[PDB]
Amino acid sequence: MTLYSGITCPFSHRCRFVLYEKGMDFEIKDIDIYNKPEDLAVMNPYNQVPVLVERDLVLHESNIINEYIDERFPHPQLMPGDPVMRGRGRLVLYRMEKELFNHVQVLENPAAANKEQAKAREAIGNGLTMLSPSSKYILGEDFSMIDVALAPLLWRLDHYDVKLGKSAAPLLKYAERIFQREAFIEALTPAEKAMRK
Amino acid sequence: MTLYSGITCPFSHRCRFVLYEKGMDFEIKDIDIYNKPEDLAVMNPYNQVPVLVERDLVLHESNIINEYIDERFPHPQLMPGDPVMRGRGRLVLYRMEKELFNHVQVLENPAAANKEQAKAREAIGNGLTMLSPSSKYILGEDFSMIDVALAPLLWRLDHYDVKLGKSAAPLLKYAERIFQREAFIEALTPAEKAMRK
Numbered sequence A, B: 001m002t003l004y005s006g007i008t009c010p011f012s013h014r015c016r017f018v019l020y021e022k023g024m025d026f027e028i029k030d031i032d033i034y035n036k037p038e039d040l041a042v043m044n045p046y047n048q049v050p051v052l053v054e055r056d057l058v059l060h061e062s063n064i065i066n067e068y069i070d071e072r073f074p075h076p077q078l079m080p081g082d083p084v085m086r087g088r089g090r091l092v093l094y095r096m097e098k099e100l101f102n103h104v105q106v107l108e109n110p111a112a113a114n115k116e117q118a119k120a121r122e123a124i125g126n127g128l129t130m131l132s133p134s135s136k137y138i139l140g141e142d143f144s145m146i147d148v149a150l151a152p153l154l155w156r157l158d159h160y161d162v163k164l165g166k167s168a169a170p171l172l173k174y175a176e177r178i179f180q181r182e183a184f185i186e187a188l189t190p191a192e193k194a195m196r197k
């Protein structure tokens, strides 16, 4: 199992986090997004990282790669068993993609306008502030893939110059609990370690 | 279990198709998208159909509702068991959402420009034509949720005035097999029956 990963890419960071939580054998191949190999576009028509390859299986889209990993290496389970909680969690993932990570892509785009990036930074702070009230982990008292998907953004709040309301103290205490997890620390690249303490 | 559904909505059509394939008890509530009730926006911040409600669970986003239904009423299974085929299928679903159903939303938007709708219609024909070569059903010899997600678009090719290449004959023969399924026919509203024979 091989992950093609960008060393500062938050979407690759999600997949690295899952891989270290499962603890199985895998290889990471670093891709410089400023100098992509031609085979990246053969694996992924969007020409982005992350990509996962295992034998004849090729996946892109970080949350889809992570679903696969969770099913492929069952234990420890990164999702609840209950179809109700799984559905609620999948919807939380979808809304984070559409309402938070769309802005993350703008901040990650070297070609985006300063004005666009300012709007994105603002929207992320506002979104996270509103989410802060809504348990130990996002779905309840158990760590899940939903926490995994959000963690690279919370790691990057200083990097992105995102400012949260004082009401968001609970979200920041939560983020510190995620960042203390052994696999979270293992998953950080040296470049991501440079983003905060 | 209650589905809030638009009578001509292809995304609602996907969920109706799943519900009739599972054969369990459910209720359909028809929502006129031109006269939405205020409670639609309380259930779904995007103020769209479909929405599924079951007790305290509220879901929107058709493919997420359908995942839930598949897990909630296990038999008959609408996905393969193999994590590899499930991952491949989830990626096919994601690419259909991003490359086909984005154009479907434009064709469904009364406010979209004629020029925008012409581009969407063109892109759907081109996309489907290219997909036509890539088995009895989309994932192989077994009917799946992936077939369910695509079927409302194929039902609507005449309605949308989408013209396919002659090379896409295999896709059209496939579409006829889907439309012969008992639950497909059960799932059609009278308005959708008016869209083709």
Ligand SMILES: N[C@@H](CCC(=O)N[C@@H](CS)C(=O)NCC(=O)O)C(=O)O
Binding pocket: A006, A008, A009, A010, A011, A012, A033, A047, A048, A049, A050, A060, A061, A062, A063, A105, A108
């Ligand atoms: N929806 C994708 C987003 C991946 C993405 O945005 N990757 C960025 C780096 S963090 C990338 O490869 N950028 C190069 C590009 O867009 O050309 C996912 O979740 O995997």
Ligand SMILES: N[C@@H](CCC(=O)N[C@@H](CS)C(=O)NCC(=O)O)C(=O)O
Binding pocket: B006, B008, B009, B010, B011, B012, B033, B047, B048, B049, B050, B060, B061, B062, B063, B105, B108
């Ligand atoms: N991504 C949604 C799309 C649903 C959608 O586009 N629904 C349309 C009708 S087919 C709707 O409610 N339109 C009203 C609106 O956008 O205001 C899903 O898959 O459920």
Ligand SMILES: [Ca+2]
Binding pocket: A157, A158, A159, A160, A161
């Ligand atoms: Ca900073």
Ligand SMILES: [Ca+2]
Binding pocket: A171, A172, A173, A175, A176
């Ligand atoms: Ca913090």
Ligand SMILES: [Ca+2]
Binding pocket: B157, B158, B159, B160, B161
């Ligand atoms: Ca026609």
Ligand SMILES: [Ca+2]
Binding pocket: B171, B172, B173, B175, B176
């Ligand atoms: Ca046909």
